[PDB]
Amino acid sequence: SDVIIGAEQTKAYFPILKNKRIAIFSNHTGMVGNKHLLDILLENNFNVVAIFSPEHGFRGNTIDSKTGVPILSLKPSEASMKKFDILIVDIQDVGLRFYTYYISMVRLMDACAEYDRKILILDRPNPNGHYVDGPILDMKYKSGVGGLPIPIVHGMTLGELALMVNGERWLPSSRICDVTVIPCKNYTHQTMYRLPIPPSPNLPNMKAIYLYPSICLFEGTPVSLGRGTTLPFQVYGHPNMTGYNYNFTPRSIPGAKNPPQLNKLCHGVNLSNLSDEEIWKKGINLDYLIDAYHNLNMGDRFFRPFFELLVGTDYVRKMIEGGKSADEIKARWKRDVERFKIQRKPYLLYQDN
C-alpha cells in the first residue's frame, strides 16, 4: 500500500517532542492534509517557537499571522539557536545536487551541532530516489548550486543524506549533529512517489521532476527550458535554433517574471509527451544538450562559465565540443556512480535499488 511519510506517524514522534521547545525547517510542502506540520503541532499543544524557511515562510505567500510563530528566512543567529531544544526538518525535495534545500539543511546541522541541539527529520520520499547518476561533484566546483561530493542524482532521501553528512564528516569543523530520522513506511528506492504539492513553481508536475536532471543543465547555457510557458522543464528551445517542429514564447508570468528569452519566439523540442517510463530508462540524458549545442553553432559560448558548477566536472563541456556522443560522455561517470552507491550504502534507510 501507499507511502506513509514520517510526519503522518505521530505516535512515533509526538513523545520526542513532548515538553520541548520546537523549531521547524519547512515550507509549503510540509503539510499533512490542509494543515502545515506547524498547525498540527500547535493543535496538539506542542510549543513551536520558530520556523526556518528556505523561501519567505511556509504559507506559500517575520511572524506567521495564523499562529504568531516567528518566521526566519535562510545560518541562524545565536539568539535564535537559544530559543529551541529540537529542530524538525519536514520538507519535500526532488533529489538533485543543484536543488538546494539540502544545503540549507547542512547549514542547520552545522549550527545544531555547534549549539548541541537535536534534529528530528520527518522523512519524505525522493521522487528521483530510484537511481544514482552523473559525475560526483569535484570540490573545485563547490558552490551555491552544489554543496557536497555527491552525484547529480544522488538517490537519497533528506534523512539518508543527513546520516551521510554526519558519517562522512561533511559538516564544517567536522562536527556531528544529533539526528533522528522517522523513516517513511511502504517505501523503497524503487517506489515512484508522486508529489501532491509542487515543490517549486516551475516544477508543476511529475514530468518536469523526472526531466529536471537532464533539462536543468540548460541553465548553464542560453537555451530556454520553458520558464514562462505552460511546460517548464518539459521543452527546450532558443530564438536562434533552426530546423525545429515546435516553438514557444516565454511570457512574463508570476514566478517566471523575467524568464530566459522573454517574449522571444523559441524554436526547439517538446518533451512533455514522453512517457514517465522512457524518461526513467534514460536517467540523465545528454542528448538534449548536445542537440542544442550543435544546432546553435556558437561554439564554446554556448556554455556559461558556471556550466561546470552544475555538472560538477570539466570533461562534459570538453567532450561535447570534441564531438563525443551522449553515451560516451555518460559512460565516463559510471564508475563514480558505482563508487557512490557503495559509499552511501551504510546511510540508506530503505531497500536499495
Ligand SMILES: [Cl-]
Ligand atoms: Cl521556480
